[PDB]
Amino acid sequence: HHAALRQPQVAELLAEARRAFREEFGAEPELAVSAPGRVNLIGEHTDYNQGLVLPMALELMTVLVGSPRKDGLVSLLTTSEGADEPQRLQFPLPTAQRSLEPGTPRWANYVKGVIQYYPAAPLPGFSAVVVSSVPLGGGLSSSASLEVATYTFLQQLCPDSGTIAARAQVCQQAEHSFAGMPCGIMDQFISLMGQKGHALLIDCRSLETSLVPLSDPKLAVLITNSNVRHSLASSEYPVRRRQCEEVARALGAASLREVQLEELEAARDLVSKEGFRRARHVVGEIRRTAQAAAALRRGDYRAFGRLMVESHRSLRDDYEVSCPELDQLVEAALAVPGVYGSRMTGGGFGGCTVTLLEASAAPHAMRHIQEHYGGTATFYLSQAADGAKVLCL
Ligand SMILES: O=C1CCCC2=C1C1(CCCCC1)N=C(Nc1nc3ccccc3o1)N2
Ligand SMILES: OC[C@H]1O[C@@H](O)[C@H](O)[C@@H](O)[C@H]1O
């Protein structure tokens, strides 16, 4: 099997969500919102180091459809097959007396976290159906898209008077506290600020962002899901953060963004062998991401793709967050004529690779990758998509 997976269009997700809502609450929902998943083109394990990242939002998205309530109740239904039980859930709005807490089902910890830290009041209660085409925990940020869709819904109930970064950070806080995943800010930011036909260069120190056109009929972004997820993934992520902090402290730096590749080379003995390799990835990856944005600006897909491949080797050998399945998928992809570059994307230890290629080479690329992969790969061909949006029903 080597054809791209169906990507449900928005009209399909809306129809499903409204049918599930009518059938469950006996009336037509009044509001719809959505927020997408994402793929990171380059700039991996840099966001929590205040570095640069270059993601784009995907046509895979999460949809909320719902209505405000007057009884201070939050009533949730999700139609997503792989969400853990129960898929119906209710709880009253938190107060200074009773705050929400992480519990079961896990998929609602994302919604609760966001309601809990939502910065404006008064928030009414609401009824809402959650649908999503983002493969749950597939490495394309299903949780961030649920958080951001929830945030975008709350804004319709109680407008915040805030900024995009504040919203991303609310959603990042929910991830940290209600899901126990100490992520950076990239996934929430792109889900919030994506735009069709654009990648988003995010400066995670200044919080400056740039919408870089990424729309060329002859260019494709191929996402390949390894469909494996090593247990190591969850546990090594904080180990990598902590190794990064060690090097930053040793160089007297607020973060590794403040550390130049040449300052690192000059301070080997102040840090371990492993910590040095981890910082060398991060420092070089920040520089590669800036160079990739420039390459994209001039339409230099060959240079962009070479930087991707250097990003992969750095992640495999210096940061050690790849795995044999990702490495095989990358090497397979790079043997296909028309492919500019390929690399793991997201956190690592499983999940997806991202491949930049000539659009006409996509059918060959998918066949060749599948035939040279010991597992069962899944594929997405995605254009750069919109971030969070609202449709009044
Ligand atoms: O178990 C893990 C491990 C860490 C990554 C991750 C999860 C699970 C969360 C619990 C249910 C299945 C998997 N879900 C997400 N994201 C997500 N779940 C959603 C449910 C409905 C709508 C949109 C959703 O996005 N991420
Ligand atoms: O670049 C690695 C990325 O891994 C993601 O899973 C994480 O949520 C992001 O914040 C980023 O750190």
Numbering used by the authors: 0 to 392
Question: Anything the authors wrote about it?
Answer:
GALK1 is a small molecule kinase of the GHMP kinase family, which catalyzes the MgATP-dependent phosphorylation of the C-1 hydroxyl of α-d-galactose to yield Gal-1-P in the Leloir pathway. In classic galactosemia, GALT enzymatic deficiency causes the accumulation of Gal-1-P, the product of the enzyme galactokinase 1 (GALK1; EC 2.7.1.6) upstream of GALT in the Leloir pathway. Inhibition of human GALK1 (hGALK1) to prevent Gal-1-P production therefore could provide a therapeutic benefit for GALT deficiency. Here, we determined crystal structures of hGALK1 bound with reported ATP-competitive inhibitors of the spiro-benzoxazole series, to reveal their binding mode in the active site.
To this end, we co-crystallized hGALK1 with two spiro-benzoxazole inhibitors (T1 and T2), in the presence of galactose, and determined their crystal structures to 2.44 and 2.10 Å resolution, respectively. T1 and T2 share the chemical scaffold of a benzoxazole ring connected to a tetrahydroquinazolinone ring by an amide linker, and both compounds are found to occupy the ATP binding site in a similar manner. The benzoxazole ring, mimicking the adenine moiety of ATP, sits in a hydrophobic pocket forming a π–π stacking interaction with Trp106 and van der Waals interactions with Val129 and Leu145. Importantly, the quinazolinone cyclohexanone and spiro-ring substituents cause displacement of two key side-chains—Arg105 and Arg228—at the entrance of the ATP site. In our costructures, both Arg105 and Arg228 are sequestered away from the ATP phosphate groups, to accommodate the quinazolinone ring of the compounds. For T2 with the larger spiro ring, the carbonyl moiety is close enough to hydrogen bond with the Arg105 guanidino side chain (dotted line). Therefore, these residues are sequestered away from catalysis in the inhibitor-bound complexes. ATP-titration experiments with T2 showed no significant change in Vmaxapp (P = 0.1801) and a significant increase in Kmapp (P < 0.0001), collectively indicating competitive inhibition with ATP by T2, which is supported by fitting in GraphPad Prism and is in agreement with its binding mode in our hGALK1 crystal costructure. We found that hGALK1 co-crystallized with galactose and T2 produced the required quantity (crystals in the hundreds) and diffraction quality (consistently better than 2.5 Å) for the screening campaign. To bias hits toward allosteric binding, we soaked compounds into hGALK1 co-crystals with galactose and T2 occupying the active site.
